[PDB]
């Protein structure tokens, strides 16, 4: 998904 989280996701 292009609208999914594009940043670091630690959890």
């Amino acid at each position, epitope marked *: 998904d*292009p*609208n*999914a*989280n*594009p*940043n*670091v996701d630690p959890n």
Partner: antibody, heavy 122, light 107 residues
Framework: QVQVVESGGGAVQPGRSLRLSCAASGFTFSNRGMHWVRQTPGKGLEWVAIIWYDGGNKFYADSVKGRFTISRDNSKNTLYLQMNSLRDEDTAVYYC???????????????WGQGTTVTVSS | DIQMTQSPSTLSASVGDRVTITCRASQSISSWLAWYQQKPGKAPKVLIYQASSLESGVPSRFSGSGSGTEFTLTISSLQPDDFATYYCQQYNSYWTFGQGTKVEIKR
């Protein structure tokens, strides 16, 4: 301050290429997705491309597919936009925009740079 | 592709007036609507995300409402610094913007 600064815009002949850069400061650039967005008075704000924090996932608007390429150098805190086969309708102010990190199912953009102007012209 | 439509395109108001800007989506975007403020020659700044969440540092006179296909940006008491163009944006499928609403100030 969270800050992004575009560079590289200028006059470019139709059919030629130009590379834009975006210098990031005031935040951890390596941990954020990044966008390119462009603006014109008529067609308004048009999203161009996005790149994941690690430089892997990339998505492009159909208007620039096959001609524009987004990339990034996390060690230099820089975002790039390689623009090939430029046309008259590519003239715009080009903004580099940081992805917002608000916890949710969907994601967008928060902080914009001052912009750099690309003028396709002979 | 989802098209966003704003109304009105331009509005004139006095300091202290309540300003209401509307934004309509061509299909349901749930609450995935952001509002931005742009001054001439300047970059847009985010005001509201998730239709109603106020970003840090944004004055409380800016309020966002709506869901599905109809959304509203409300300025409770217009200030001189609120002279700007305001853009809505859906982030349900990629990112598309409305055409913008210019707010001019009578004095």
């Amino acid at each position: 301050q969270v800050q992004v600064v575009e560079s590289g815009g200028g006059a470019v002949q139709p059919g030629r290429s130009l590379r834009l850069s975006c210098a990031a400061s005031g935040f951890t650039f390596s941990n954020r997705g990044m966008h390119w967005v462009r603006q014109t008075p008529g067609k308004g704000l048009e999203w161009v491309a996005i790149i994941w924090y690690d430089g892997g996932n990339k998505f492009y608007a159909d208007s620039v597919k096959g001609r524009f390429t987004i990339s990034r150098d996390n060690s230099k805190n820089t975002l790039y936009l390689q623009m090939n086969s430029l046309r008259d309708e590519d003239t715009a102010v080009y903004y580099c925009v940081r992805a917002g990190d608000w916890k949710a199912d969907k994601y967008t953009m928060d902080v914009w740079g001052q912009g750099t102007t690309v003028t396709v012209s002979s | 592709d989802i098209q966003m439509t704003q109304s009105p395109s331009t509005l004139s108001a006095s300091v202290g007036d309540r300003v209401t800007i509307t934004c309509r989506a061509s299909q349901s975007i749930s609450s995935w609507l952001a509002w931005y403020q742009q001054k001439p020659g300047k970059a847009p700044k985010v005001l509201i995300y998730q239709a109603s969440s106020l970003e840090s540092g944004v004055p409380s006179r800016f309020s966002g409402s709506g869901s599905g296909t109809e959304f509203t940006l409300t300025i409770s008491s217009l200030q001189p610094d609120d002279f700007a163009t305001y853009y809505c944006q859906q982030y349900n499928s990629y990112w598309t913007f409305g055409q913008g609403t210019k707010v001019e100030i009578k004095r």
